[PDB]
Amino acid sequence: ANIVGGIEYSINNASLCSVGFSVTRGATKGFVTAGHCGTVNATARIGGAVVGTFAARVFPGNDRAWVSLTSAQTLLPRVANGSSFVTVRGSTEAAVGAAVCRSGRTTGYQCGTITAKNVTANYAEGAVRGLTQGNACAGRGDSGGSWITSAGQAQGVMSGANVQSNGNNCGIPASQRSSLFERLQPILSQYGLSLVTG
């Protein structure tokens, strides 16, 4: 499978999450995603086929994970934006006020701005700290997906949002959305990963 930020993958034939970013760990191919999406050694499938397993994760506290892929997978420096692509150029962290977009399999590609950093989400499982907030909308299924600027700087992976009964927060004004992502930089240094760029 071609590994692109934003696309669907399943975990142990049950949950769905979205791919965050293609990365490598020495000769190993992988992708970063949210930690709440799978436990270590959970099987990841893309389009019915086994592409790899969860190698590590931290959830709650933080919300991060990376999936080690088999050699057959093609890693690509890209995030899906409809039928088009955004090239991953690096991971400079954007400041509050910066515009940002996110990509996932439920709501597609949505943009908004970063409104706050170091937010705590109190999920049923425990708190997750250090999250950045934007007001781009998102829905159930988008977790793990890419948050990236138009210029190609990877910001982090989708953690959670104040979804309404329709499963997303796209039907409430941007001013009332709290869509949270896990910063990419600590995930890259914690697992010794390098971002695939183009």
Partner: peptide, 4 residues
């Protein structure tokens, strides 16, 4: 906010 809930996970996703």
């Amino acid at each position: 906010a809930a996970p996703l």
